[PDB]
């Protein structure tokens, strides 16, 4: 998997985009690696922003659906044409698959003005795909068509760089052990948080308030978001623990910017095991992010927790679709000082994980 290293880019707060190939002849697009969505979606008229967009009629394998596709989000928002092609990439399997692609016509607060990405890879199963499940997502599409194991592997480094390893694990990307997390429901990468520290402190929450609704793992979002009763309850621990300096409550909020004294996370992830569970450490790097301006990348949600590059970030992460779970390892190339660096720690007791679920 030599090739497939290195083979992500971005600027930070603007995602990773992967180099892919569309169509007969091949058309190159920068193409976002999303976790936390499962459509294709890729520019196909001649938007501002965009640095090139996929052209349909110079595509000899192009198949039409005659089926359109409206996406609103909670903000912005994109309509498609959907159709199949012929998709490859480049730095990744030597193989390439017909996969279903929303060839964007319309958009609104979708594209990023400066970014170097025209599309987004979709990378969660059928079941939040739209319109509907039956709409087979890209790498369900690889799985079938091809001998790829049904597995990848992101290592997003902290412009920004990284690494999506595409039917396997690069041992070179991460020092100590995987640890792994089932995935409860196939839909987002939904995963359970069992015990929330923060400098080695319990939050002493209900543990079904860190999983409302859910939990997942988001490579197209750049915060660590809680539910806004952990988040309150978050924060006012890493109030207590930078107690030293004095910071507006607008900060706390992600309403302004600031410009040692801040604490470890540690989220405690579901084992394998029945009471077993191990816990993921990030540091102040990783939630205090540059904009020397810093954003505080920690915010209040209503759609549960979202695992986004604040975590990714200090681990590589390994989506093991075939047995139903994801894998966390201390990242080779995280950001750290020489007294703090993120770990992936177990095994520890932890019980009644199951009552953590939201039902
Ligand atoms: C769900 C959802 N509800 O409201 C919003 C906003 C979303 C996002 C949808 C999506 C598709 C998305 C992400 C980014 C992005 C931004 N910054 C760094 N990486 C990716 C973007 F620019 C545009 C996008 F459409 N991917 C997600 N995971 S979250």
């Given at each position: 998997f030599?090739?497939?290293?290195?083979?992500?880019?971005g600027?930070?707060?603007?995602?990773?985009?992967?180099?892919?190939?569309?169509?007969?002849?091949?058309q190159?697009?920068?193409?976002?690696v999303?976790?936390?969505?499962?459509?294709?979606?890729?520019?196909?008229?001649?938007?501002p922003?965009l640095?090139?967009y996929?052209?349909?009629?110079?595509?000899?394998?192009?198949?039409?659906?005659r089926?359109?596709?409206?996406?609103?989000?909670?903000?912005?928002?994109?309509?498609?044409?959907?159709?199949?092609?012929?998709?490859?990439?480049?730095?990744?399997?030597?193989?390439?698959?017909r996969?279903?692609i929303?060839?964007?016509?319309?958009?609104?607060?979708?594209?990023?003005?400066?970014?170097?990405?025209?599309?987004?890879?979709?990378?969660?199963?059928?079941?939040?795909?739209?319109?509907?499940?039956?709409?087979?997502?890209?790498?369900?599409?690889?799985?079938?068509?091809?001998?790829?194991?049904?597995?990848?592997?992101?290592?997003?480094?902290?412009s920004?760089?990284?690494?999506?390893?595409?039917?396997?694990?690069?041992?070179?990307?991460?020092?100590?052990?995987?640890?792994?997390?089932?995935?409860?429901?196939?839909?987002?990468?939904?995963?359970?948080?069992?015990?929330v520290?923060?400098?080695?402190?319990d939050?002493?929450?209900?543990?079904?308030?860190?999983?409302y609704?859910?939990?997942?793992?988001?490579?197209?979002?750049?915060?660590?978001?809680?539910?806004?009763?952990?988040?309150?309850?978050?924060?006012?621990?890493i109030?207590?623990?930078?107690?030293?300096?004095?910071?507006?409550?607008?900060?706390?909020?992600?309403?302004?910017?600031?410009?040692?004294?801040?604490?470890?996370?540690?989220?405690?992830?579901?084992?394998?095991?029945?009471?077993?569970?191990?816990?993921?450490?990030?540091?102040?790097?990783?939630?205090?992010?540059?904009?020397?301006?810093?954003?505080?990348?920690?915010?209040?949600?209503?759609?549960?927790?979202?695992?986004?590059?604040?975590?990714?970030?200090?681990?590589?992460?390994?989506?093991?679709?075939?047995?139903?779970?994801?894998?966390?390892?201390?990242?080779?190339?995280?950001?750290?000082?020489?007294?703090?660096?993120?770990?992936?720690?177990?095994?520890?007791?932890?019980?009644?994980?199951?009552?953590?679920?939201?039902?």
């Amino acid at each position: 998997f030599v090739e497939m290293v290195d083979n992500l880019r971005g600027k930070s707060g603007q995602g990773y985009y992967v180099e892919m190939t569309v169509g007969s002849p091949p058309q190159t697009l920068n193409i976002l690696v999303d976790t936390g969505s499962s459509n294709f979606a890729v520019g196909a008229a001649p938007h501002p922003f965009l640095h090139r967009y996929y052209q349909r009629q110079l595509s000899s394998t192009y198949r039409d659906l005659r089926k359109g596709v409206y996406v609103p989000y909670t903000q912005g928002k994109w309509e498609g044409e959907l159709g199949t092609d012929l998709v490859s990439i480049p730095h990744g399997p030597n193989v390439t698959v017909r996969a279903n692609i929303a060839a964007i016509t319309e958009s609104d607060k979708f594209f990023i003005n400066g970014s170097n990405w025209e599309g987004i890879l979709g990378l969660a199963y059928a079941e939040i795909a739209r319109p509907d499940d039956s709409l087979e997502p890209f790498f369900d599409s690889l799985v079938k068509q091809t001998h790829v194991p049904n597995l990848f592997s992101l290592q997003l480094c902290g412009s920004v760089g990284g690494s999506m390893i595409i039917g396997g694990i690069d041992h070179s990307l991460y020092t100590g052990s995987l640890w792994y997390t089932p995935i409860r429901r196939e839909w987002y990468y939904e995963v359970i948080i069992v015990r929330v520290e923060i400098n080695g402190q319990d939050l002493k929450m209900d543990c079904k308030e860190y999983n409302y609704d859910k939990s997942i793992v988001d490579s197209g979002t750049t915060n660590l978001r809680l539910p806004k009763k952990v988040f309150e309850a978050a924060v006012k621990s890493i109030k207590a623990a930078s107690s030293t300096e004095k910071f507006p409550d607008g900060f706390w909020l992600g309403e302004q910017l600031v410009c040692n004294i801040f604490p470890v996370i540690s989220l405690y992830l579901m084992g394998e095991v029945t009471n077993q569970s191990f816990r993921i450490t990030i540091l102040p790097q990783q939630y205090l992010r540059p904009v020397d301006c810093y954003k505080f990348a920690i915010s209040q949600s209503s759609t549960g927790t979202v695992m986004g590059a604040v975590i990714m970030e200090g681990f590589y992460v390994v989506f093991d679709r075939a047995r139903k779970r994801i894998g966390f390892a201390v990242s080779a190339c995280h950001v750290h000082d020489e007294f703090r660096t993120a770990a992936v720690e177990g095994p520890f007791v932890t019980l009644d994980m199951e009552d953590c679920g939201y039902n």
